[PDB]
């Protein structure tokens, strides 16, 4: 009724909406996020849009911290995958919850935006895959399926 692969496909759709609407709120603009094509309005698109709004205030308070640490991290095309996986693993080491799932979407957004601002174009799909595959391989996609799929993320907050 809700396989891990189904959640993975939904995650890509949720994340694209998350990226577009989160960037639209915060707006130098990232044209890759301004022009990111999205599927027709759907429940999955609605989740990503709602998850973007609920972080509007909080994200600004954390900008200075994440942006300073990403500058110190100096993520690149060669090390982005390793760094994402280690950071995401530590985040979920003590358990899975909706806040950490949303935080993972947010880190993917921040990581993709940071590398673009430093010249790494055409990498947004790579970061999307990082997010999707990490969830799939680290039991997060299954966790969402156990909660009924991404529809359970609707109206959080």
């Amino acid at each position: 009724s809700m396989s891990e692969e189904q959640v993975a496909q939904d995650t890509e759709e949720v994340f694209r909406s998350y990226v577009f609407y989160r960037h639209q709120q915060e707006q130098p603009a990232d044209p890759e996020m301004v022009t990111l094509p999205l599927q027709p309005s759907s429940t999955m698109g609605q989740v990503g849009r709602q998850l973007a709004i609920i972080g509007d205030d909080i994200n600004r308070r954390y900008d200075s911290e994440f942006q300073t640490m990403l500058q110190h991290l100096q993520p690149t095309a060669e090390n982005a995958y390793e760094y994402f996986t280690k950071i995401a693993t530590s985040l979920f080491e003590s358990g899975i919850n909706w806040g950490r799932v949303v935080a993972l979407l947010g880190f993917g957004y921040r990581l993709a935006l940071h590398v673009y601002q430093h010249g790494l174009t055409g990498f947004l799909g790579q970061v999307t895959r990082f997010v999707v595959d990490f969830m799939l391989h680290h039991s997060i996609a299954r966790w969402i399926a156990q909660r009924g799929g991404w529809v359970a993320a609707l109206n959080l907050g």
Binding site: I54, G55, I58, Y62, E65, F66, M69, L70, H72, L73, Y83, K86, I87, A88, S90, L91, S94, N97, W98, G99, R100, V102, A103, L104, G106, F107, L156, G157
Partner: peptide, 22 residues
Amino acid sequence: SLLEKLAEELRQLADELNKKFE
């Protein structure tokens, strides 16, 4: 760590999000 400190910030972010979710 830098990587662990980033994961720490993400847990703290997740904590504030969870508070709003409940």
